[PDB]
Design a protein around this ligand. Structure first.
Ligand SMILES: CCNC(=O)Nc1cc(C)on1
Length: 166
C-alpha cells in the first residue's frame, strides 16, 4: 500500500510571506503529486508564519523534490526538510560493523544516500584495533534524514545500528 504519510511530508521553512497554498503547490508539484499543501498563518491576522508543509503521494517524490534543491519559491530560497522520528546534522554513527568492515564497504553503501565527505573507522587509542563502529559525514543533512528513518542497514553482511551523531 501507501507509505506512511509522515514519511511523505516536507516541512518548508523560510517562505516568503507572500507565498500562498496555491503558489507553494504550483512550485512543488513540479516533482510529484501533492496530496496536501499548507502555508501556516496567524489565526487572527492571516499573516504568514513563514513556513508550511507539502505532502507528496510517494517517498520517491519527496526524494525528487529534495534532489532539486535549492528551491527558490516566490523569489526566496526556502529550506525543505523531511520528518525523522528536527535535529539537522550531516554526520552518522554506524555501529555493529565489527573488525572486518573497511572504508570501501561503508562508502559503496552510504554514497547512495548522499555525497560523502569523511569516513572515520574507529580504532582503539592504545592497540590500534578496530572498535566496530564508524562515523560518516555527508555534505548535506537529507542523506542523514533518509538513513535514520530506515528500519534496517546491512553493510558487509552486518546488521548495523545507525544514528545521528553530535
Ligand atoms: C519549518 C517547517 N515546519 C516544521 O518544522 N514543522 C511544522 C510545519 C507544520 C505545519 O507543522 N509543523
Amino acid at each position: 500500500p501507501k507509505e506512511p504519510e509522515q514519511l511523505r511530508k516536507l516541512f518548508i521553512g523560510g517562505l516568503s510571506f507572500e507565498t500562498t497554498d496555491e503558489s507553494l503547490r504550483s512550485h512543488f508539484e513540479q516533482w510529484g503529486t501533492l496530496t496536501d499543501c499548507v502555508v501556516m498563518r496567524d489565526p487572527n491576522t492571516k499573516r504568514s508564519r513563514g513556513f508550511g508543509f507539502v505532502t507528496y503521494a510517494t517517498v520517491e517524490e519527496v526524494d525528487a523534490a529534495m534532489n532539486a534543491r535549492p528551491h527558490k519559491v516566490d523569489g526566496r530560497v526556502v529550506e525543505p526538510k523531511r520528518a525523522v522520528s528536527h535535529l539537522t546534522v550531516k554526520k552518522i554513527f554506524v555501529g555493529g560493523i565489527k573488525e572486518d568492515t573497511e572504508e570501501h564497504h561503508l562508502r559503496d553503501y552510504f554514497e547512495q544516500y548522499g555525497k560523502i565527505e569523511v569516513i572515520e573507522i574507529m580504532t582503539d587509542r592504545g592497540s590500534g584495533k578496530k572498535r566496530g563502529f564508524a562515523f560518516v559525514t555527508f555534505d548535506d543533512h537529507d542523506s542523514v534524514d533518509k538513513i535514520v528513518i530506515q528500519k534496517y542497514h546491512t553493510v558487509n553482511g552486518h546488521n548495523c545500528e545507525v544514528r545521528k551523531a553530535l
